[PDB]
Amino acid sequence: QKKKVTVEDLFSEDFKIHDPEAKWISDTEFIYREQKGTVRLWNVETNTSTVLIEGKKIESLRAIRYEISPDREYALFSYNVEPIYQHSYTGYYVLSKIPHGDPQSLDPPEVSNAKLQYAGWGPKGQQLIFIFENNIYYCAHVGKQAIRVVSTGKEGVIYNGLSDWLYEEEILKTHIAHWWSPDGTRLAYAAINDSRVPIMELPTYTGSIYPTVKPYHYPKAGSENPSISLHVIGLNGPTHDLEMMPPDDPRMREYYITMVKWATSTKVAVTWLNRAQNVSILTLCDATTGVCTKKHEDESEAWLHRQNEEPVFSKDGRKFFFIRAIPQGGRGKFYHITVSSSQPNSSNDNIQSITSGDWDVTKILAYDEKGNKIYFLSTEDLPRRRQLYSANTVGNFNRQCLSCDLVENCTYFSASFSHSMDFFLLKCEGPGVPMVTVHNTTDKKKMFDLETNEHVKKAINDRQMPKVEYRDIEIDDYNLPMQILKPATFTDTTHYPLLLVVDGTPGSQSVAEKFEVSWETVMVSSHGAVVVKCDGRGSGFQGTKLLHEVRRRLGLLEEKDQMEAVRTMLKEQYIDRTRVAVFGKDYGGYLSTYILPAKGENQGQTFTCGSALSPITDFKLYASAFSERYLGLHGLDNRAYEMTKVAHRVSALEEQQFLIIHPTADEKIHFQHTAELITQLIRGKANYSLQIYPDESHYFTSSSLKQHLYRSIINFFVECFRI
Amino acid sequence: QKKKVTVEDLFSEDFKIHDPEAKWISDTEFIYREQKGTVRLWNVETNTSTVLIEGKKIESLRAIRYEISPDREYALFSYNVEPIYQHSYTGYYVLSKIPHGDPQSLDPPEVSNAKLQYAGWGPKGQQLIFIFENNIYYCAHVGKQAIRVVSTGKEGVIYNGLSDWLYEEEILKTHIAHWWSPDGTRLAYAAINDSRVPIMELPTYTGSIYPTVKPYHYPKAGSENPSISLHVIGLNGPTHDLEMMPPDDPRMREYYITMVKWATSTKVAVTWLNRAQNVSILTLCDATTGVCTKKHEDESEAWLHRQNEEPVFSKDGRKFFFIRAIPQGGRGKFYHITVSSSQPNSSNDNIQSITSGDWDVTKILAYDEKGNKIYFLSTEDLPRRRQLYSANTVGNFNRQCLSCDLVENCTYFSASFSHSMDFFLLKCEGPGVPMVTVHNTTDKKKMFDLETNEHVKKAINDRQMPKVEYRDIEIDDYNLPMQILKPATFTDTTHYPLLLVVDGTPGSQSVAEKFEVSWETVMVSSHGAVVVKCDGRGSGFQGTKLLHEVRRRLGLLEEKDQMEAVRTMLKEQYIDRTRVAVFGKDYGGYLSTYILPAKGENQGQTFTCGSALSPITDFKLYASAFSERYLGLHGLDNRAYEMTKVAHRVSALEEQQFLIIHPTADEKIHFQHTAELITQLIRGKANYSLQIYPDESHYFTSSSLKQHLYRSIINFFVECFRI
Ligand SMILES: *[C@@H]1O[C@H](CO)[C@@H](O[C@@H]2O[C@H](CO)[C@@H](O[C@@H]3O[C@H](CO)[C@@H](O[C@H]4O[C@H](CO)[C@@H](O)[C@H](O)[C@@H]4O)[C@H](O)[C@@H]3O)[C@H](O)[C@H]2NC(C)=O)[C@H](O)[C@H]1NC(C)=O
Ligand SMILES: *[C@H]1O[C@H](CO)[C@@H](O[C@H]2O[C@H](CO)[C@@H](O[C@H]3O[C@H](CO)[C@@H](O[C@@H]4O[C@H](CO)[C@@H](O)[C@H](O)[C@@H]4O)[C@H](O)[C@@H]3O)[C@H](O)[C@H]2NC(C)=O)[C@H](O)[C@H]1NC(C)=O
Ligand SMILES: *[C@@H]1O[C@H](CO)[C@@H](O[C@@H]2O[C@H](CO)[C@@H](O[C@@H]3O[C@H](CO)[C@@H](O)[C@H](O)[C@@H]3O)[C@H](O)[C@H]2NC(C)=O)[C@H](O)[C@H]1NC(C)=O
Ligand SMILES: *[C@H]1O[C@H](CO)[C@@H](O[C@@H]2O[C@H](CO)[C@@H](O[C@@H]3O[C@H](CO)[C@@H](O)[C@H](O)[C@@H]3O)[C@H](O)[C@H]2NC(C)=O)[C@H](O)[C@H]1NC(C)=O
Ligand SMILES: *[C@H]1O[C@H](CO)[C@@H](O[C@@H]2O[C@H](CO)[C@@H](O[C@@H]3O[C@H](CO)[C@@H](O)[C@H](O)[C@@H]3O)[C@H](O)[C@H]2NC(C)=O)[C@H](O)[C@H]1NC(C)=O
Ligand SMILES: *[C@H]1O[C@H](CO)[C@@H](O[C@@H]2O[C@H](CO)[C@@H](O[C@@H]3O[C@H](CO)[C@@H](O)[C@H](O)[C@@H]3O)[C@H](O)[C@H]2NC(C)=O)[C@H](O)[C@H]1NC(C)=O
Ligand SMILES: *[C@H]1O[C@H](CO)[C@@H](O[C@@H]2O[C@H](CO)[C@@H](O[C@@H]3O[C@H](CO)[C@@H](O)[C@H](O)[C@@H]3O)[C@H](O)[C@H]2NC(C)=O)[C@H](O)[C@H]1NC(C)=O
Ligand SMILES: *[C@H]1O[C@H](CO)[C@@H](O[C@H]2O[C@H](CO)[C@@H](O[C@H]3O[C@H](CO)[C@@H](O)[C@H](O)[C@@H]3O)[C@H](O)[C@H]2NC(C)=O)[C@H](O)[C@H]1NC(C)=O
Ligand SMILES: *[C@@H]1O[C@H](CO)[C@@H](O[C@@H]2O[C@H](CO)[C@@H](O)[C@H](O)[C@H]2NC(C)=O)[C@H](O)[C@H]1NC(C)=O
Ligand SMILES: *[C@H]1O[C@H](CO)[C@@H](O[C@@H]2O[C@H](CO)[C@@H](O)[C@H](O)[C@H]2NC(C)=O)[C@H](O)[C@H]1NC(C)=O
Ligand SMILES: *[C@H]1O[C@H](CO)[C@@H](O[C@@H]2O[C@H](CO)[C@@H](O)[C@H](O)[C@H]2NC(C)=O)[C@H](O)[C@H]1NC(C)=O
Ligand SMILES: *[C@H]1O[C@H](CO)[C@@H](O[C@@H]2O[C@H](CO)[C@@H](O)[C@H](O)[C@H]2NC(C)=O)[C@H](O)[C@H]1NC(C)=O
């Protein structure tokens, strides 16, 4: 009847969602970040959305990033930013006054127009720091000249203020590794030493006539990890730099610092996780002593999970709210909020959780000390959803679900409260087209809409959007969610081809009510096929027990859980056994290539064709922090790294078409994996096909490229599908 | 009716030809190298084939190579752990006495069980040398301890006695670069300096956890070439090392030494070719003076060809027989034998050729000074054949064709004469199953058979061998030969798919009556398809004019010549326009990917699918010696390297399937080419498919691998063929 979703549509200015990136500045107003060019400043109390910056950003060579100072008198702009790893704000930095006019290059002292690794504003006034060649420079006053506060930096070897590869990609999940005290007087920063970490060479084939390798420190499983230390310096006066000394538990001689936050302007909280990732230690250090005191500690049989977890302290640095796994009677433990006094005394804990049940809390948003309110997101509704809740810090702990069925057509949520909990920004993300709204904490009434994305709502309604469907299945005391997407003009007579899209990274979640549109949408819409996603054991958001089911068995269970979801889908009559395919990327590529068998024996050849994008195929060749977490430390050969090798599985492979896609200069999952895999396919005399992306990184931060990628992928399955 | 030729057959112990590798030791007997294990020693005069070595070679960890000493009292052996046998004479060597028993490791002085880069026997006695870490060691007596005669060697940078990459692959065509004087008193050796040659890094993805690149000197077009010098040392007494000084012709400031041979035990012949390869200088040097004297010189407009050409001298070092291009009236010049006195005096040449015509002489085999006989191979019969001839060095120069229709069922030939021309070994090579015979020079009578390969003759007769067919076509004053292979059970009703197999390396020859069986045979036999080969301009064995037609036009003409051969084949009715495919490897892969167009416009899409194995795609990235030879020197940008880029052609590509096969650690044609090519396929939004061979070299010296290769190739075409 009307237009099917096509790839062009995917990259259409029509289907582009616009995130206002709203951010509170006070307890009465939020930034009202770019509406579609200009940057405003809404004032919820008395609708006064002033103008802070305008389409003069386009002027500054389309500054990719920008940040208004605290005193709201300047703005920090970055342009010609080039991406490094996951997230890497690293380009040219310019400063300008709030209304408009007169930009200025932010360069270190004595150096000309040079790229910076990071800029960003301080907490108070217009203080700011910027990192150049791994050294931290500071400027209190905008006119003041920069001062090199820390100078032990050494490009690619000694990082301070920013993460090294492993810290950004695996252990800290951010490139930023420094933290200002609340009063902007002291600055805490991690100092990472990759000096003794092995160096991986990345192959190049396109640069000059004689391409050369790009080296960088990357620790494979078992090798030496980056050595880290936490430091703090004064931002006024001689600045005495002090290192925050770590605990002692002999079960913490090799560790990662996974979390650091200021409890007050004198004390800073730190979580110390040991390399084996089975022992954790929360700590309060004196930013003037360097003495850290144990404030709690956890240990697990498998591996500690969710360790970047930031605690919420009471303005007086007194008691605080953390969140961890608590037994929850039977059926593993779940993540819930917990309370402890500021000065936990050696004997026992102040232990006592605020929430409980067989559901996980996923994010503490705020603590209203003036009474008993603690806002957060949870899976209490359905693990596939995200609702905003609130509980009483006192007596009862009654949970009131603020979102739940408010602003309908969407059940996935994110939100932030004003600097007084009064109001809060609330964003959808699904199931319906995403949007941003504003409410007053108490009332819960939509004070107004910030972004509705009508463009998108229109365009979507002009297309045969796929039809969603959730069908919890189950193995053992576990129920595995699994959403199935149907062609939208789905009947029951016709038989459709099955496309299993598997991720399966332990801890992640593939079945959720978020709003997404990718090449999968195109496959369902434009080429009419049903896609199936399922979250087996190892999945997150369903308690420790489920999660840890894959310990030292990476890729074994998930093969069964996935095959079981395929089988139950094969039983239906609106799907024909002959056209079954599988796809997966990253850890998903591993599972993807792991799942190309034949169930039973007489009933062989379950899949027709499969594909893996940047597949990991040997955890011996993968990042320490990841492999060791699920298979335990290597060295003395934990011999879990042997049976998990996907090589053992390709031995089968009889008639399936195998398409491997892999960007050549992949810094996360080295092309080395794909290379080793193909070697096996060759010895095993199997048939494969490779598509390469010469000198390309792991992420695909190019609409142009991402597009080509998708097209390639759809062109593969769509082929081994039509008959 | 009976078995079709299959891949298994190809690698069957049944279809394996056995080359006795017969080699004369005197004027009455040849080695009778391995009959199928044991090594004998036939005595043609009185049938006495003694036994020199036996299946005791299998003993010595299956020595891959072996060589009996001159005094026939010892035997050199060589094996390779991690078996791979190009024949870079590198591995572990052992010495043993002629009958049998007691092997001994040949290691340098003071070093233990270590690999050697080369061994080999001297001319007289049992003298021998061996190269270790690019230094030459000498042992006169078997018991004598080695002496490091030359010690300026530096692994991978300073080679002496052996070629560096470029010298082995392109300019000398051998890894061996040393030559003993006839009397074993003086030793000449090339000293190659790659010190200032750029170093190419080869990507590795499989070795250790952290793969690393493998570096080595490789000169791309325009870069600095290896610097060479010729040296001579005495093998008895203090050994004064002397360098043979090169000429002066300012048109020889940058040169390659392409040929060196001893004229006597005091004089050595050297051919000096300049980098541009358009000026050549034959020279006689005094192995005791170092003074080289011009003895002749050639220059061409295009490029000199066949420069490794060794001259044949009269026992008294007097007059000699060379072979070069001589005008031959009209229609270019052809290669024929030439005579000159030993001491050519400055004025004019002793010039006067012995043979002439529109055919090429391809190899001087011997000179019988006792009269007037000069034996050689030629294309005088048909360029697609090789017959043994003879001519009179005196008065007439009458050519008598010794082979021609002798031992029928085969017209391709190779041969060698005893150390007195009396008898001669004669080997087939085609068209019928290969074999080795023995005749007495005068008589021409088959004294007996040395190797008949009945196994093969049997097995072949049990199979539906493809049917051969030659069909000279023509463009301009040139007739382009083109053999076509038919399915053997070929009718005329049925329509067959066309498989154009193109090589096209300038100077080479693809259409010849040699006996070959590869995946092409399987394609014709087992999958019934007709393959077509054609030799357009640039081909060899048909005079200078034809050859040089491609100068600075690499890939242009050959596209037309090839397309024309395809068209004339398309006209037939036993072939259907719908299933036309093309394949090529190396320079053939270049042409292969160059030929994926549509003739005319309305009659587009000439090919359905094509494939290129290790395709060169940019002569700027190829070996200097090769590119510069056909496109002229680079540097000041000869801008022929731009239009020849295959990139310009892939722009078309609309519906064809493109399968690129490339071994990753290819040292001859860098994977870099395939990488650059794919980048273009991506920008041009074309469809391709890559098959890689992780860490594999360029050659495929593994039956196991070679097999997988073939299978892969047949599996591709056979697919886009069946309907
Ligand atoms: C890698 O790919 C190879 C081909 O690209 C695969 O080889 C085929 O493997 C099958 C099964 O092992 C072989 O048996 C087949 O049996 C079928 C009937 O039983 C035949 O199919 C019929 O229809 C096809 C449709 O195209 C026709 O082409 C065919 O002529 C026939 O009439 C098959 O042809 C064949 O008998 C088959 O021989 C193989 N095919 C070919 C041409 O290689 C291989 O399995 C894959 N994996 C590996 C190498 O292990
Ligand atoms: C500051 O906060 C304001 C809070 O009101 C905000 O205004 C928002 O609220 C009003 C009303 O609550 C929204 O009203 C709009 O939408 C409704 C329903 O679509 C319309 O109602 C009816 O429309 C019919 C037409 O069929 C008309 O005939 C009826 O008389 C009736 O009005 C309204 O007409 C109106 O369009 C308003 O949309 C909403 N604002 C947004 C866009 O979110 C203020 O916007 C805000 N101050 C600023 C700076 O705008
Ligand atoms: C790369 O491969 C893709 C598919 O693997 C090629 O796409 C195909 O291109 C044709 C036309 O170029 C599409 O249209 C066809 O039109 C005829 C009408 O004459 C019709 O009979 C066919 O049914 C077909 O619709 C074809 O649909 C399309 N295939 C798909 C579904 O993608 C592409 O041409 C190749 N090279 C490129 C990208 O240029
Ligand atoms: C990672 O970065 C740190 C700095 O954050 C590096 O520190 C340097 O470590 C070397 C040792 O490898 C020190 O040199 C040694 O000094 C001692 C003096 O006691 C001397 O005996 C040795 O011969 C050697 O010279 C160096 O002083 C130190 N840099 C300074 C001055 O702070 C560290 O090496 C890197 N990785 C690690 C943990 O080794
Ligand atoms: C969390 O994982 C760590 C890492 O395995 C566990 O710690 C222990 O690590 C040490 C490594 O020094 C292992 O010690 C071994 O103990 C045996 C005892 O006979 C000794 O003979 C060996 O020489 C070696 O010292 C030990 O295997 C390992 N413990 C475990 C889990 O087996 C830590 O205990 C784990 N925590 C839990 C219970 O989750
Ligand atoms: C949640 O609320 C939205 C509104 O914010 C709902 O929008 C409605 O979406 C349906 C799609 O099923 C629209 O239907 C279409 O109407 C047009 C009328 O021109 C017709 O041409 C199409 O064939 C189709 O029937 C409907 O117009 C729209 N309602 C309006 C007018 O606002 C939405 O359905 C709800 N859930 C979601 C996200 O689907
Ligand atoms: C390739 O190999 C040769 C040897 O066969 C290299 O010879 C070395 O050349 C360097 C110059 O690049 C010499 O060093 C210089 O020596 C002069 C002597 O007066 C001195 O004044 C300079 O300060 C410098 O040290 C070096 O002596 C020589 N090696 C020896 C001792 O034999 C040659 O350099 C390599 N390729 C080329 C042409 O550079
Ligand atoms: C030394 O030289 C001998 C001289 O010929 C070898 O003999 C060979 O030649 C004879 C005849 O010329 C062959 O005759 C037999 O085979 C043919 C083949 O069909 C028959 O038609 C004929 O009736 C004979 O039966 C020998 O077979 C042939 N021998 C070989 C193997 O070549 C003689 O063999 C050789 N000395 C040795 C060591 O055998
Ligand atoms: C190969 O041919 C030679 C001739 O070169 C044969 O030997 C004699 O040749 C002369 C001609 O110069 C004849 O007059 C003799 O009659 C030949 N010998 C005889 C009687 O056969 C020789 O026999 C052949 N091969 C060998 C040397 O065995
Ligand atoms: C957020 O919006 C609601 C409007 O519905 C406000 O609620 C009123 O608050 C006053 C207290 O200042 C009460 O006395 C009224 O009874 C409330 N109105 C009613 C009847 O709903 C609220 O004031 C707004 N923001 C906040 C938190 O004050
Ligand atoms: C063979 O080629 C060389 C170079 O290509 C010719 O020598 C000259 O080399 C210089 C480089 O310094 C060029 O500038 C000249 O243009 C070259 N001469 C020519 C061909 O114009 C050499 O003469 C060539 N031989 C011939 C005549 O073909
Ligand atoms: C060349 O001669 C051989 C003899 O060595 C011929 O052999 C015959 O080959 C056919 C194959 O078509 C077989 O059917 C016959 O049985 C063979 N003859 C016998 C019985 O020996 C051969 O035909 C000729 N050409 C080639 C190489 O095929």
Domain boundaries, chain A: 1-464, 465-723
**How far from the centroid of its chain's Cα atoms is residue B427's Cα?**
17
* Residue B323: closest CA among B379, B242, B371: B379
Please work out whether the CB of residue A145 comes within 6 Å of at least one atom of ligand 2. Answer: no
Do the Cβ atoms of A220 and A620 come closer than 8 Å?
A: yes
Dihedral sign from CA coordinates of A570, A573, A579, A581:
negative
How far apart are alpha carbons A480 and B208 in whole angstroms?
39
- Report helix angle A557-570 to A587-594, nearest 10: 60
Amino acid, single-letter form, for residue B491: T
Backbone torsions φ then ψ of A554, nearest 5 degrees: -40, 125
Closest Cα to residue A309, out of A349, A338, A331, A274?
A338
Give the N- to C-terminal CA distance of chain A in Å, as an integer. 24
Tokens 């009465």, residue located: A28
Residue with tokens 């794909």: A674
Spatial contact of A451 and A34, defined as CB atoms under 8 Å apart: no
Q: Which residues neighbour B318 within 8 Å (Cβ) at sequence distance 6 or greater?
A: B341, B342
Instruction: Encode B645-668: b = buried (16+ Cβ within 10 Å), e = exposed.
Output: bbbebbeebeebbbbbbbbbbbbb
Per DSSP, A546 falls in state H
- Among A655, A658, A657, residue whose Cα is nearest residue A674: A658
Task: For B161-174, give one letter per residue: b (16+ CB within 10 A) or e.
Answer: bbbbbbbbbbbbee
- Cα–Cα distance measured from residue A323 to residue B284, given in angstroms and rounded to the nearest whole number: 90
Q: In this structure, how many other beta carbons lie within 10 angstroms of the beta carbon of residue A557?
A: 18
Residue A363 backbone phi and psi in degrees, to 5: -175, 115
- Phi-psi category of B563—alpha, beta or left, where left has phi over 0 and alpha has psi -120 to 50? alpha
- CA of residue B540 relative to chain centroid, distance: 14
User: Residue B45, SS3?
Assistant: helix
> Looking at ligand 12, which atom is closest to the CA of residue B432?
27
User: Distance between CA A470 and CA B303 in Å, rounded?
Assistant: 73
Look at residues B64, B73, B76, B188 and name the one whose alpha carbon lies nearest to residue B128: B76
Contact B200 A206 (CB under 8 A): no
Which residue in B200, B203, B691 is closest to A690 by CB distance? B691
Q: What is the resolution of this structure in A?
A: 3.0
Give the gap in angstroms from C-alpha B461 to the nearest C-alpha of chain A: 30
Nearest CA to B697 out of B206, B159, B356, B33 is that of B206
Q: Which CATH superfamily is domain A465-723 in?
A: Alpha/Beta hydrolase fold, catalytic domain (3.40.50.1820)
With CA atoms as reference, report the closest residue to A51 among A63, A68, A65, A64.
A68
Q: Taking CB atoms and a 6 Å cutoff, what residues make up the pocket around ligand 9?
A: B 440, 442-443
Strand partners, B581: B499, B609
Pick the closest to residue A193 from A160, A236, A150 (CA basis).
Answer: A160
Q: Mutual orientation of helices B587-594 and B557-570 as an angle, nearest 10°?
A: 60
Backbone angles phi, psi at A546, to 5 degrees: -60, -50
Give the β-pairing of B530-532 and B484-485.
antiparallel
Nearest residue CA, atom 6 of ligand 6?
A: A409
Topology of B1-464 in CATH?
Methanol Dehydrogenase; Chain A (2.140.10)
Distance in Å, CA A420 to ligand 10 centroid: 16
**Is B85 exposed, middle or buried, given 0-12, 13-18 or 19+ CB atoms closer than 10 A?**
middle
Å from CA of B3 to ligand 12 middle: 17
Cα(A266)–Cα(A317) distance, rounded to whole angstroms?
10
- Method used for this model? X-ray
Q: Pull the structure tokens for residue A330.
A: 């039977």
First to last CA, chain B: 24
Contacts of A212 in chain B (CB under 8 A): 201
The radius of gyration of chain B from alpha carbons, rounded to an integer in Å, stands at: 26
- As a residue count, chain A comes to 723
A411 vs A430: CA distance, rounded Å? 6
Smallest Cβ distance to A676: which of B205, B685, B711? B205
Tell whether B607 lies on the interface with A, counting CB pairs under 8 A: no
Collapsing DSSP states into helix, strand and coil, what is residue A417?
strand
DSSP state of B252: G
Residue with tokens 């030439």: B338
Pick among B216, B682, B710, B718 to test the A interface (most A CBs inside 10 A): B682
Alpha-carbon distance of A433 to A448, in angstroms, equals: 17
Write down the H helix ranges in A278-332. Answer: none
Q: How far is CA A550 from the centre of its chain?
A: 21
Residue B106, C-beta contacts closer than 8 angstroms, at least 6 positions apart? B76, B93, B94, B95, B116, B119, B130
Q: Whole-angstrom Cα distance, residue A545 to residue A331?
A: 7
Is B515:B608 a contact under the CB 8 Å cutoff? no
Chain B partners of A694 at a C-beta cutoff of 8 Å?
675-676, 678-679
Say how far apart CA B618 and CA A97 lie, in whole Å. 52
d(CA A705, CA B482): 44
**Fold match flag (B1-464 vs B465-723):** no
What's the distance, CA A128 to chain centroid? 26
- Give the Cα separation of B211 and A307 in Å (integer): 32
DSSP state of B618: -
Distance CA A536, CA A561 (A): 5
* Alpha carbons A573 and A482: distance in angstroms, whole number: 18
- SS3 label, residue A228: strand
Q: What is the distance in A from the centroid of ligand 1 to the CA of A617?
A: 28
A575-585 and A496-501 strand pairing = parallel
- Taking the C-alpha atoms of residue A615 and residue B428, their distance in angstroms, rounded to an integer, is 52
CA-CA distance, A461 to B111, in Å (whole number)?
81
Radius of gyration, alpha carbons of chain A? 26
Helix extents (H) in A445-597: 454-461, 519-525, 543-548, 557-570, 587-594
Which residues, 6+ apart, have CB-to-CB distance to B101 below 8 Å? none
- Measured CA to CA in angstroms, residue A279 lies from A167, A695, A721 at distances of 18, 39, 49
> Tokens standing for A95?
């400063």
The values of phi and psi at residue A675, to 5°, are -65, -55
Ligand at shortest distance from the CA of B488: 12
CA angle A715, A717, A720 (to 5 degrees): 105
User: Nearest Cα to B536, choosing from B495, B593, B475, B491?
Assistant: B475
Distances from the Cα of A660 to the Cα of A476, A648, A663, A681, B187, angstroms? 34, 17, 10, 12, 55
